[PDB]
Design an enzyme around this catalytic site. Structure first.
Site, PDB file in Angstrom:
ATOM      1  N   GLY A  32     -23.459 -42.025  34.598  1.00 49.66           N
ATOM      2  CA  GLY A  32     -24.703 -42.291  35.317  1.00 49.66           C
ATOM      3  C   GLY A  32     -25.745 -42.945  34.427  1.00 49.66           C
ATOM      4  O   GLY A  32     -25.769 -42.725  33.214  1.00 49.66           O
ATOM      5  N   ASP A  87     -31.908 -44.913  34.752  1.00 47.52           N
ATOM      6  CA  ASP A  87     -32.797 -45.763  35.566  1.00 47.52           C
ATOM      7  C   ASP A  87     -32.508 -45.538  37.045  1.00 47.52           C
ATOM      8  O   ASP A  87     -31.453 -45.909  37.560  1.00 47.52           O
ATOM      9  CB  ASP A  87     -32.753 -47.260  35.190  1.00 47.52           C
ATOM     10  CG  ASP A  87     -32.941 -47.505  33.677  1.00 47.52           C
ATOM     11  OD1 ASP A  87     -33.345 -46.560  32.947  1.00 47.52           O
ATOM     12  OD2 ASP A  87     -32.666 -48.645  33.208  1.00 47.52           O
ATOM     13  N   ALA A 116     -20.439 -38.914  36.012  1.00 52.41           N
ATOM     14  CA  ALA A 116     -21.031 -38.000  35.011  1.00 52.41           C
ATOM     15  C   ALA A 116     -22.487 -38.373  34.877  1.00 52.41           C
ATOM     16  O   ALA A 116     -22.799 -39.452  34.380  1.00 52.41           O
ATOM     17  CB  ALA A 116     -20.331 -38.083  33.635  1.00 52.41           C
ATOM     18  N   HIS A 162     -26.345 -38.820  33.642  1.00 54.20           N
ATOM     19  CA  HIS A 162     -27.030 -38.857  32.352  1.00 54.20           C
ATOM     20  C   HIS A 162     -27.922 -37.610  32.167  1.00 54.20           C
ATOM     21  O   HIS A 162     -28.461 -37.095  33.152  1.00 54.20           O
ATOM     22  CB  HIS A 162     -27.846 -40.134  32.196  1.00 54.20           C
ATOM     23  CG  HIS A 162     -28.266 -40.400  30.785  1.00 54.20           C
ATOM     24  ND1 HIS A 162     -27.625 -41.319  29.974  1.00 54.20           N
ATOM     25  CD2 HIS A 162     -29.252 -39.855  30.028  1.00 54.20           C
ATOM     26  CE1 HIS A 162     -28.196 -41.332  28.783  1.00 54.20           C
ATOM     27  NE2 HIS A 162     -29.192 -40.458  28.792  1.00 54.20           N
ATOM     28  N   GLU A 217     -19.038 -36.447  26.148  1.00 52.12           N
ATOM     29  CA  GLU A 217     -18.015 -36.345  25.111  1.00 52.12           C
ATOM     30  C   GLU A 217     -17.400 -34.944  25.085  1.00 52.12           C
ATOM     31  O   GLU A 217     -16.162 -34.798  25.056  1.00 52.12           O
ATOM     32  CB  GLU A 217     -18.539 -36.702  23.709  1.00 52.12           C
ATOM     33  CG  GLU A 217     -19.148 -38.044  23.556  1.00 52.12           C
ATOM     34  CD  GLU A 217     -20.645 -38.024  23.813  1.00 52.12           C
ATOM     35  OE1 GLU A 217     -21.128 -37.131  24.557  1.00 52.12           O
ATOM     36  OE2 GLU A 217     -21.352 -38.924  23.298  1.00 52.12           O
ATOM     37  N   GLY A 274     -24.585 -45.465  24.981  1.00 53.83           N
ATOM     38  CA  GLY A 274     -24.164 -45.041  23.647  1.00 53.83           C
ATOM     39  C   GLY A 274     -22.862 -44.243  23.582  1.00 53.83           C
ATOM     40  O   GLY A 274     -22.147 -44.258  22.563  1.00 53.83           O
TER      41      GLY A 274
HETATM   42  N1  LIG Z   1     -23.745 -40.226  31.701  1.00 47.12           N
HETATM   43  C1  LIG Z   1     -23.972 -39.856  30.460  1.00 47.12           C
HETATM   44  C2  LIG Z   1     -24.578 -40.722  29.597  1.00 47.12           C
HETATM   45  C3  LIG Z   1     -24.846 -40.308  28.292  1.00 47.12           C
HETATM   46  N2  LIG Z   1     -24.475 -39.042  27.845  1.00 47.12           N
HETATM   47  C4  LIG Z   1     -24.802 -38.601  26.496  1.00 47.12           C
HETATM   48  O1  LIG Z   1     -25.885 -39.421  26.092  1.00 47.12           O
HETATM   49  C5  LIG Z   1     -25.629 -39.956  24.792  1.00 47.12           C
HETATM   50  C6  LIG Z   1     -26.238 -41.414  24.582  1.00 47.12           C
HETATM   51  O2  LIG Z   1     -26.704 -42.166  25.849  1.00 47.12           O
HETATM   52  P1  LIG Z   1     -27.631 -43.608  25.901  1.00 47.12           P
HETATM   53  O3  LIG Z   1     -27.367 -44.541  24.742  1.00 47.12           O
HETATM   54  O4  LIG Z   1     -27.441 -44.271  27.385  1.00 47.12           O
HETATM   55  O5  LIG Z   1     -29.145 -43.079  25.944  1.00 47.12           O
HETATM   56  P2  LIG Z   1     -29.432 -41.658  25.189  1.00 47.12           P
HETATM   57  O6  LIG Z   1     -28.343 -40.662  25.645  1.00 47.12           O
HETATM   58  O7  LIG Z   1     -29.174 -41.881  23.581  1.00 47.12           O
HETATM   59  O8  LIG Z   1     -30.738 -41.014  25.493  1.00 47.12           O
HETATM   60  C7  LIG Z   1     -24.116 -40.003  24.733  1.00 47.12           C
HETATM   61  O9  LIG Z   1     -23.661 -39.899  23.393  1.00 47.12           O
HETATM   62  C8  LIG Z   1     -23.643 -38.829  25.604  1.00 47.12           C
HETATM   63  O10 LIG Z   1     -23.475 -37.568  24.960  1.00 47.12           O
HETATM   64  C9  LIG Z   1     -23.867 -38.176  28.715  1.00 47.12           C
HETATM   65  O11 LIG Z   1     -23.544 -37.044  28.337  1.00 47.12           O
HETATM   66  N3  LIG Z   1     -23.620 -38.602  30.018  1.00 47.12           N
END
Ligand SMILES: Nc1ccn([C@@H]2O[C@H](COP(=O)(O)OP(=O)(O)O)[C@@H](O)[C@H]2O)c(=O)n1
Ligand SMILES: Nc1ccn([C@@H]2O[C@H](COP(=O)(O)OP(=O)(O)O)[C@@H](O)[C@H]2O)c(=O)n1
Lengths: 325, 325
Positions: free
Chosen positions: B207, B210, B230, B232, B252, B275
């Site tokens: 997810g 935004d 999943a 965010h 993860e 990320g």
């Molecule tokens: N749908 C998602 C997206 C991100 N994540 C976690 O969010 C971390 C980084 O996402 P990103 O670069 O879009 O933005 P931020 O999560 O760093 O705030 C990932 O390493 C995942 O652990 C998640 O658990 N589920």
């Protein structure tokens, strides 16, 4: 002897957990500071609370952080852009130029102005050079080392062009030639209509926040025949045999209201050197007394306190607390 | 266009009230930050909340402030002295060397170590010099101006002798010759016992936070036949027609648990450049896909994102969302 870890994201918390699991023999306090709270965040916070000697989760107000831990998108840039407030001017206590210094710099073009922290503004630079402060490894040396550094940065690092002081006629530490000093009086004694003091004397002791002045205080109340205690806002315990005055006002405000209502009453305020004596000296029908308990050490108050008080015209009464039952 | 006022004592709040009452035509946001809360404090906070356009009262943990607004007594010095923790080492995200910089300096002899903020560590210094960032008054210029300054201070102001990175084989912004780089892997793929991928394919969309990617996301799920989203952790809304996976784990972790439990299942993770794709690429039986929606602008993700992804070996799929009902 401890280690700190600071976090602001779930993945940083996983890092904190790896760091701790690698130092099994060390003690950790762990702070998470985050704008978001939810099932996901808590779960990883609580994982850390189970390994850390101590853990706290500041749940900050939305949009306090203008940077990003991730690489932002045009969307993520625009949203933060247009919520970041537009800031023309910032007012803060002089010493907050030190502690909120990192926020200040994120508003480089905001005009800055300061006001007094409190009575700590009244200790002049050189006073921190006194013998009283100059022994070594002592608790008084560390304090002076600290203030000298903090005042330096408050005066020299984020140019602010004006300082508000609430104390008329006492030299301010911030009066350094680098800024305008403005007197801002907090308290309006006019419109009070205070006359000649007939119809009686009300005596009030200002409470100490030191839980350890409880017995000195109770004796003071008995010795000088004071009926009422005004408790300190930082104060947390009670006095026996003295009627506590419960009120939402701080002492100065409360006394202003009483004078309006009781314009012929003599007000006697007794205090172990509380700042209030300084804001209150010139109130009509108010007479302030500093109490110096003989059983405390001489160095229990810093030399500049005594100087400031007599400089301000306040009587310092020696009080032989040990002679009171 | 606003003015800020910061306070940490009742009398400073009275000053804030005088300042505001003197600028009737101005807008004020007022923050009180205090270790004490009580009838007295609230009363004066609520007086300010009634005049300010906005007001917030951070109730800080006891003993965070090692200085004094008043002149302290030997008692007040000793208590603060012997509660001030003894601090040997401090761990924090690289950018927190900027924002928690004022606390760091109050522990001048603490050894400092940092770790990655997140994917923002992976944009190298020069990238912020790109044409993409170099037009003027633009939102992208201001971001680059900011990061350049923040990284500078993170690298140069409170010497820290080691930086932990969670990304194997991608150059870190903090890799500046002034510190040791250590790889700290967050995720254990061994002991998972992942075998040949038989018994089926599970598809999951990551997810977006935004709220505006809701319809792109729903289309992605339909186009590529993804059953699960999943969400965010920063994410706040829902998708229709896609089973949301509710869990306290971040992606993860959740995927690691699933592989243990389902060692022959093919895992396909679809993502608009999260990320997570970077932390997850090498997981056994996991295949990651970046989705680039044709209907968004090209500059919706920063050039370094695309580079990082293909550098990392992740497929970037063009997705013609407008061709999906
Ligand atoms: N749908 C998602 C997206 C991100 N994540 C976690 O969010 C971390 C980084 O996402 P990103 O670069 O879009 O933005 P931020 O999560 O760093 O705030 C990932 O390493 C995942 O652990 C998640 O658990 N589920
Ligand atoms: N018993 C007391 C003592 C102080 N105060 C308030 O506390 C202010 C300063 O007290 P202080 O110098 O002992 O220590 P702080 O109050 O600055 O924390 C005064 O100006 C009063 O408004 C009070 O309302 N009642």
């Amino acid at each position: 002897p401890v280690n700190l870890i600071f976090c602001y994201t779930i993945l940083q918390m996983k890092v904190a957990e790896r760091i701790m699991a690698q130092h099994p023999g060390e003690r950790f306090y762990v702070v998470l500071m985050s704008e978001n709270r939810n099932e996901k965040y808590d779960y990883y916070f609580n994982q850390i609370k189970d390994k850390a000697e101590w853990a706290y989760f500041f749940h900050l107000p939305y949009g306090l952080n203008k940077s990003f831990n991730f690489i932002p998108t045009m969307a993520e840039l625009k949203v933060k852009a247009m919520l970041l407030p537009k800031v023309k001017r910032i007012y803060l206590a002089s010493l907050e130029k030190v502690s909120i210094a990192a926020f200040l710099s994120t508003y480089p073009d905001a005009e800055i102005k300061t006001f007094d922290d409190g009575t700590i503004n009244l200790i002049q630079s050189s006073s921190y050079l006194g013998d009283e402060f100059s022994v070594n490894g002592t608790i008084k040396r560390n304090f002076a080392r600290m203030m000298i550094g903090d005042w330096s940065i408050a005066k020299t690092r984020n140019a602010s062009d004006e300082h508000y002081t609430i104390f008329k006629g006492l030299k301010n530490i911030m009066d350094d030639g680098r800024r305008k000093m403005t007197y801002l009086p907090l308290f309006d004694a006019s419109e009070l209509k205070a006359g000649d003091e007939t119809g009686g004397t009300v005596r009030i002791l200002l409470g100490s926040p030191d839980k350890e002045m409880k017995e000195i205080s109770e004796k003071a109340a008995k010795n000088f025949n004071i009926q009422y205690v005004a408790p300190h806002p930082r104060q947390t315990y009670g006095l026996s045999g003295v009627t506590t005055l419960n009120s939402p006002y701080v002492i100065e405000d409360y006394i202003l209201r009483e004078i309006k209502k009781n314009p012929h009453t003599r007000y006697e305020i007794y205090t172990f050197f509380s700042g209030a004596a300084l804001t209150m000296k010139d109130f009509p029908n108010v007479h302030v007394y500093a109490l110096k308990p003989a059983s405390l050490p001489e160095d229990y108050w810093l030399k500049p306190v005594y100087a400031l008080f007599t400089q301000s015209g306040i009587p310092i009464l020696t009080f032989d607390d040990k002679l009171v039952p």
